[PDB]
């Protein structure tokens, strides 16, 4: 039974080239190039899911650091205070209350100050 392998192939072809729209070049157009790019796009998106976990953490850290240094304390000592005080907030919500509430963040900074030991010995 000679099969005429068109339909079977056009399935995945239309797959790739609908998940490939919006590509500058011969990539939304042609199929093999859309496939080369699909492999690269999905490794990029895979790497960027992890990468973005880490990157948002680094951004939040930059922000908490900026609000801390607005309160004359460094990010290191801020974290060591929010640890020793124990307020189990995390850098994400800590940065949110940093943005919207300078008041709540400065309460947090005074919390951290009140929970620093004495010195650079211990």
């Amino acid at each position: 039974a000679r099969v005429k392998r068109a339909v079977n192939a056009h399935k995945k072809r239309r797959s790739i080239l609908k998940a490939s729209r919006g590509y500058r070049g011969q990539r939304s157009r042609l199929y093999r190039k859309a496939k080369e790019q699909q492999l690269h796009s999905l490794n990029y998106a895979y790497r960027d899911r992890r990468a973005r976990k880490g990157e948002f953490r680094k951004l939040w850290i930059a922000r908490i650091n900026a609000a801390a240094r607005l309160n004359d304390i460094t990010y290191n000592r801020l974290i060591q205070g929010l640890k020793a005080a124990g307020v189990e907030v995390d850098r994400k919500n800590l940065a949110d209350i940093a943005i919207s509430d300078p008041a709540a963040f400065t309460a947090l900074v005074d919390v951290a100050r009140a929970a620093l030991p004495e010195d650079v010995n211990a």
Binding site: L59, R63, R77
Partner: protein
């Protein structure tokens, strides 16, 4: 999600740094942090918050004397040879603001936002800056804590 960077959401203040006796590295780092806008918590690497920074008295900004005569500023012209070596000594008795501006631009990131940001830094040799139209508030440098 953030709430900090959006349309017309960022604030534009001004700063005057008197580069009176300060050293070049601290000065440039301070101006760069003000210029990018990391002194701000409402920060993002995509947007341009940050303050217009003015650096005055940049004529007398401290460099090691043993560096005013050794550290050189090369700038190649594409043409063979054409490497235009130049120390910061003659470069200072010609354009100290160019020295300072060079250091600052070097401490910024390397992107297009770097350009949009550095268009905010003015630097002048004498004490007299012309951008007094605003209320340029003096920001002086202060190591913090820890």
């Amino acid at each position: 999600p953030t709430y900090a960077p959006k349309a017309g959401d960022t604030t534009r203040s001004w700063y005057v740094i008197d580069a009176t006796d300060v050293v070049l590295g601290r000065l440039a780092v301070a101006a760069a942090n003000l210029l990018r806008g990391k002194h701000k918590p409402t920060f993002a690497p995509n947007v341009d918050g940050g303050d217009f920074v003015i650096v005055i008295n940049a004529d007398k900004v401290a460099i090691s004397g043993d560096k005013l005569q050794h550290k050189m500023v090369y700038r190649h012209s594409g043409y063979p040879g054409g490497l235009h070596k130049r120390t910061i000594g003659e470069l200072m008795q010609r354009h100290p603001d160019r020295v300072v501006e060079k250091a600052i631009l070097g401490m910024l990131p390397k992107n297009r936002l770097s350009r949009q940001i550095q268009r905010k830094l003015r630097v002048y040799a004498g004490p007299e800056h012309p951008h007094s139209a605003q209320q340029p508030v003096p920001y002086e440098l202060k190591q913090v804590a820890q």
